[PDB]
Scaffold this active site. Sequence first.
Site, mmCIF file in Angstrom:
data_model
loop_
_atom_site.group_PDB
_atom_site.id
_atom_site.type_symbol
_atom_site.label_atom_id
_atom_site.label_comp_id
_atom_site.label_asym_id
_atom_site.label_seq_id
_atom_site.Cartn_x
_atom_site.Cartn_y
_atom_site.Cartn_z
ATOM 1 N N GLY A 185 0.805 -1.223 0.000
ATOM 2 C CA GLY A 185 0.000 0.000 0.000
ATOM 3 C C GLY A 185 0.835 1.268 0.000
ATOM 4 N N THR A 186 0.159 2.414 -0.080
ATOM 5 C CA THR A 186 0.838 3.714 -0.129
ATOM 6 C C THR A 186 1.384 4.062 1.255
ATOM 7 O OG1 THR A 186 -0.849 5.372 0.494
ATOM 8 C CG2 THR A 186 -1.032 4.415 -1.729
ATOM 9 N N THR A 187 2.278 5.044 1.316
ATOM 10 C CA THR A 187 2.930 5.395 2.574
ATOM 11 C C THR A 187 2.026 6.285 3.422
ATOM 12 O OG1 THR A 187 5.107 5.317 1.482
ATOM 13 C CG2 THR A 187 5.017 6.319 3.678
#
Lengths: 243, 231, 250, 241, 196, 244, 222, 204
Positions: A29-31
């Site tokens: 997933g994104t940060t």
Amino acid sequence: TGYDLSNSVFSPDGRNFQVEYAVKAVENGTTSIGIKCNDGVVFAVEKLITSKLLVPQKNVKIQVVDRHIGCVYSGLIPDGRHLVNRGREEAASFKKLYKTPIPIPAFADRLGQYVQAHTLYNSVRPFGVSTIFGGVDKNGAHLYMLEPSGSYWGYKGAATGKGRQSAKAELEKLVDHHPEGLSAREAVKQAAKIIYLAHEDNKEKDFELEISWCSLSETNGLHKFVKGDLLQEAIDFAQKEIN
Amino acid sequence: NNYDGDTVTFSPTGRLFQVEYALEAIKQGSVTVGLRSNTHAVLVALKRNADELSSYQKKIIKCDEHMGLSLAGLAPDARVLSNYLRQQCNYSSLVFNRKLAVERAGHLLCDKAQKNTQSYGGRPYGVGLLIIGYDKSGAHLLEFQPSGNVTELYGTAIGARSQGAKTYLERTLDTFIKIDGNPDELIKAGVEAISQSLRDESLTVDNLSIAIVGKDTPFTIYDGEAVAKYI
Amino acid sequence: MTDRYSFSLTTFSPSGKLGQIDYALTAVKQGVTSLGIKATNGVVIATEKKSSSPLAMSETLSKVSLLTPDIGAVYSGMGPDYRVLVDKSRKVAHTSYKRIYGEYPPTKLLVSEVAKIMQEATQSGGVRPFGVSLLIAGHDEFNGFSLYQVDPSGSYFPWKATAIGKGSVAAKTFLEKRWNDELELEDAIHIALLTLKESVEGEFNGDTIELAIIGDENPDLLGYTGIPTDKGPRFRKLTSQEINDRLEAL
Amino acid sequence: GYDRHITIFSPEGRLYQVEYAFKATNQTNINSLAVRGKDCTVVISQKKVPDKLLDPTTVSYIFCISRTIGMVVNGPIPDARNAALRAKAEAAEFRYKYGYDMPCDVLAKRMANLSQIYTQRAYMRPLGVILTFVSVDEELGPSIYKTDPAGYYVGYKATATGPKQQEITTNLENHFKKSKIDHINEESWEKVVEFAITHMIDALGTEFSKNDLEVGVATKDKFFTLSAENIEERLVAIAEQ
Amino acid sequence: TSIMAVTFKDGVILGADSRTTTGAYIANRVTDKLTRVHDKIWCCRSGSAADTQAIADIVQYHLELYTSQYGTPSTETAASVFKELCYENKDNLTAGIIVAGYDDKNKGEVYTIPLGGSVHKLPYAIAGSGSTFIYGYCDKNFRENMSKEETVDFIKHSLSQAIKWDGSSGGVIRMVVLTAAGVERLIFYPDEYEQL
Amino acid sequence: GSRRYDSRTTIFSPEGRLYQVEYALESISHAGTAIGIMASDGIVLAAERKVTSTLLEQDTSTEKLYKLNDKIAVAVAGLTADAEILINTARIHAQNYLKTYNEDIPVEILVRRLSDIKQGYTQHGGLRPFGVSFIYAGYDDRYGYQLYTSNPSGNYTGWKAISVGANTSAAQTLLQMDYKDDMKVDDAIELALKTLSKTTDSSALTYDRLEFATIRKGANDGEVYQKIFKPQEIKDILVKTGIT
Amino acid sequence: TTIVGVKFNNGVVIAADTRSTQGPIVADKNCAKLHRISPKIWCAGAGTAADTEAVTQLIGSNIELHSLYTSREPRVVSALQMLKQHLFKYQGHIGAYLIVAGVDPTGSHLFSIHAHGSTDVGYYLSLGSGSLAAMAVLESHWKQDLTKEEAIKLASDAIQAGIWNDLGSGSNVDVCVMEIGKDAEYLRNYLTPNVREEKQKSYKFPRGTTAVLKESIVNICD
Amino acid sequence: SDPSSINGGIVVAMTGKDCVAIACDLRLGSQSLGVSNKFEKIFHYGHVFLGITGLATDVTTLNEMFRYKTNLYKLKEERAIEPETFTQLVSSSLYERRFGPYFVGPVVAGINSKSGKPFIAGFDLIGCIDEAKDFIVSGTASDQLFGMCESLYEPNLEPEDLFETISQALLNAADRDALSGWGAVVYIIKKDEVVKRYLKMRQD
Ligand SMILES: COc1ccc(C[C@H](NC(=O)[C@H](C)NC(=O)CN2CCOCC2)C(=O)N[C@@H](CC2CCCCC2)C(=O)[C@H](C)CO)cc1
Ligand SMILES: [Mg+2]
Ligand SMILES: [Mg+2]
Ligand SMILES: [Mg+2]
Ligand SMILES: [Mg+2]
Ligand SMILES: [Mg+2]
């Protein structure tokens, strides 16, 4: 083997492989991050711009719980929403019975116990998110990070998703260089920077930045989104630092 | 492979294969397009028929006076989900005297689909939806996928060969976004977008389906002679 | 969420065996030896208190349990399974008997109830059989003294004397030689202590042996006086001191 | 072998899932130890905060279950917290139903029973934890009772748990062979704590700063944990010796 | 029954008479109406003895569980738990409860929960059948921030009068002092309070 | 989910048999033989205990023969504990009937309900069948003396003479050879014991490895009596027919 | 009924009359109103006869099971809590008015319980129709620091006041003494001050006085 | 409207020297209308005798229920239930219906077969046990029976004397009650013979 085909089965080393597989979805997933500050907490997240066609500013990912708690997460977005809905029910029921808004440590265990419960049976799947959350209560500011296993601790700063390592290193520098504390307005700026730094590990598509915060002095101890002048001011401080 | 027996199982790389297979029914679906200006929002959908003797399956469903959607994938699943939306819009009206925000409609759909991806015995929904509406903050377009992911867009498309229309809309962005105060010009751009996804075939009178909602326009659906204006 | 295991986990194999019951009996085999002997005026049940570390206080772990004032139990196999069976056995003596008839159940009927509980763990959905065999000794007015064995299947049998667990083949042979229908309780205690020495490895004293009797009524153990017809429990646990007194004259 | 995935017997009469839950017990790589004074019961456990980003005050495996009972866990934190919440609820309910405080040994039995159920009923997994309960019981005095994933439990003169448990165990057995009594013959809990830390040091062959330990003490009518400061003051007194 | 709780400089004091009646018969002349639901959160009970005991027992259980999980509960929180029980079960309860406690942040607090299960935070509160007779007196003589000895005298004089006029009040006057110092139980016998 | 571990106890094989019923019957075939023989003036029940130890308490014991009411008894072949569950059900069923109609339950009606309970475990609920076959011996004023059997399938049938458990093949042949319609109880007693004597897997048939019962018209006029034999009575009746 | 409880030095004593009524009629001239909950916890009960008896047996049963489970001697406060919560649940429809007393590892105890589930603590208590006659005596003669003998005297005097002055009480005095460190001693019919005087006449009839229509032997066998 | 006095009837039991007696009238009415002259109110389960007065439908129902329960008892225990034990079974059974009770006044009579003791007990409709050395009474003429028994009775009567005493208690009590009488039955019970006699009595 086949120890990894069913949630809640111990492998011979004593692991629950389905949870470890949920962790892989989180790493994909994104940060997202949180920084604990002097009298508050700051949350920020990277939103990949998939296409021109996404309406800027109109796909919000940070979520409020009660009026004093912010939650952000990386991994399967719907799982995160489901977890926050539960958090909201837990906060309402605490407030209903006890009157005071739910303390952050109290709130952290409600989420923890619920996430841990999804590692107890083979008829449910573990949560595919790591969740960073916190806020301000009668004892001050608290920041927490919670894993698919139901593991959580209190953090000085925390990060997860694809850029977790770059962000972690960046967070560590701030903790070493500021043992007296970071101010809320300061922490907002650092948050922008670290999301920009951490976007290195994910640079196909460019991104939209999103920040939120609770501070006893800057937001009156309530969760609010950082928009407008204060957002752009922090976007600029981040731009400055990658160049 | 060993990990695709049910929705309650993660693969070793953290994937959910039953959800991914549900996503695949969308890809075999007939194409549909959504796009909006600041005053209206439009759906265009290419309907598919069984053969020359059959009807062309509806792909557009009204949810309330100010909201509706188009489908691509399993139709019964769209009927279940649209019926839920109809109820949610309706509850907002009866209890709060308040037309349901398109954004909440989106969150409610995400949460409904999510449940079916974490519990044993159920299956994910096998349909994608494009939701348009006009509410207290103007025109909106939403893309629903049965993974539970819902996304707000200026325009998009789903189904087989939706990639063409989606690139077209990506190029055209600055044009259509300002077709304000003009119904027939937003539609024509939508009909153009969908044309970038046709093969072996083109838009006829029992084949094309359009819907529009906006500032002073109830969600209304055009089929048959009323789309001839547009071919 | 919730139990979706509503099907049996014990089933017939093509040869006709019930695998899980056989395997439970295997766990009983590995268990520490326990036994019981029936005298003319009493019953004795005994086992070895095999301790897990010497830091453990093994007086806090009772292998021989009072079920009613005239009935006691001991086991071989899985200790935790036994502990919850004792809890349930005690309760069922009240719910299914004393609360109805105003008196404690006779030995065979309490045994019958425990056996029922164990049989159900052999057929009900989503459970495994109990991994224990029980020896239940008791007295009741119209049957006198009795001793029963209960196995993982829920089957139970009355014995003059028997043993279960680890060294049960050898101990059953020993008891066949020494048992007669004229044994007085004290003789049966002595035979029990001899039989148990065969199977015990380490220390063999009143702190490593657990032994109880179903014998005479004990008015001094009652806790009150003034009801002539209440004469006291017939179940008595032998003390560490009482066991050693009998081990010197061995 | 599906007899290895759920809690049914294997052909040799074993429960693999229970055995593998014991292996999860050591996942944290922490050792814990408990001893009884005359007046008190002391429990200590190692505290390891690897990450610099952690708020160290929130990292704990010791729990106040009731005013009178403390519990230390060896095992992963999510299972440990699950056990702690349940034990807290059970102790409160006992007090309400029966009009007196739940004894340490009775709570231990109750939690041991719940664990037994997970070893027999298929739909529940065992918790991968060992639970050491401590108190100064009003009938029994200083008390240590320990629970495991098999549903076994017993009282102890003293005990230890974790990867290097055998070292600590034999260390303690050797002391009790020498001393010839059931406990630490000491008036103050401060000195019983000092004993505990001292014998942990010999057995593990390592030194501790104030942040390497975590300590809980039970006396008549309260169980409490120590601050980094009360521990430092205790470390200092061992050193000046 | 005559009961009251009064905030003051150092915290709060609760007081009560010791009479419980069945009609005109005095079933218990030395009752203890001051009941602890936490170390420094107490209540005084009026109405049905069975109802108020059942409620206080449930509250004590809730606050002991709150404590286990979240640390010491506020006096407001305790009053909220009483209210929840009294309001939700208003058809089946005859309970008039005064809650009083001492935080270190909040000092002394008093909440009164009358019959319908509403909540009212106050500088002081009076309740029970005998309270009707001392509304005039208490309103005239109460001041904020009195001393411990002044507050004890206020309560002693107030309940003295409630006892004098109300047949359903009597016996001894019990008080509980709640400060940073701890918890102090006072008792005052007829021969003292009757001739004030 | 849990589907993984479900054996599906209630499905047909491709041949259209019920696996678990078949496997339950295989289990029963290793149990102590039990025989029922019906005469014009009564019924015999005889059964062989499972390989005894000298220390078993033979007189306070019961494993094979149980009383359902005053007019009806059963012999058990299979799992004893499974059988006790069904026996208590049957006892309760009998009392309900007596309570409802003020008449003792007709033998078939009791047999049918127990067989229906067994049948249910083969068609729904996903539980294993009861590993039990019964021989029912009883009297009522409609059909007089009656014998039935039921097995794990819930199928029941009536007999003049029948065996269940081990060696029913050999036993049925021997019964067929010597049974006659006009036979009396005392002849049937002898036939039952001789048949066990020849099919037994032990060296010789002794009193301590048997259970034995009769249901006669054998008291005062028109009323029926159940006799569960004490050990000494079996010892005598074994001599009285010259097997020892 | 009349029933009482009195604390003394090293324990507690309870007592009761032995009359049971149905309307104005004496149903039982020598019933037992003292109930064993556990060996050293005893209960005196007034009110609806079967309710006092059933509630006392139910809680006694559960106390036994609790005692076994915990490996401890049962406490009076546990019996008190279980009784009060059971009675409260039934909103006074279970008409049991109880004096609960005993000794346990915590000391000696004396409580009362009303049918709606409220409880009291005291050194001397009385319940039942005769409780005002008994309380008159208790309030007259009770003092701090009573010996066992003094307490037994006070308690049976209190019951006697009920026997003579309350039409709802009569016949005999029963006592139970629970002293710390000793067995509880139950003194059934401790006082018997109401023995029937000799009748004036035997009413035994000449055999054959009663006209009979038929006879038969009843079969109680098999 | 009062279920305990719709049908009418009485039961009385007495102890003697190594014997007990239990008797009952035969009337079953519907208020003023006498309906049946043969309605017996005493039953037995092995050697334990039970008399039941009150609402006749509950009398019948309780007999069928106690026959049910004692039959299962005998099958499981392998012995006849004794009077002390049966008395407990009656009590629990009645109390189980605490808030919707059977409108009955049962009476147990028998000799314990191990101890030889004669045993009698009575109950209220809700299961409260009344154990007595001398006599138990029940039904619509219970005041009358209490008066007769309390004066006529003396301890240790021989079986043939006890018969006369119990019969006179019953007969004269019944004749002062509109809803009792119409015939009577007396059981004389000794360790192993039981004699049942029908009394001649006034038929109004
Ligand atoms: C609500 O109605 C009541 C309440 C209390 C009584 C007194 C009580 N007698 C009884 O319970 C008698 C045996 N049974 C009945 O009166 C039948 N009642 C019918 C309607 O519901 C209640 C049961 C009785 O004798 N109580 C004794 C103490 C008993 C004696 C028997 C051993 C158990 C305790 C006592 O309280 C004095 C005599 C008056 O109550 C009668 C009716
Ligand atoms: Mg399990
Ligand atoms: Mg009420
Ligand atoms: Mg007054
Ligand atoms: Mg008449
Ligand atoms: Mg007439």
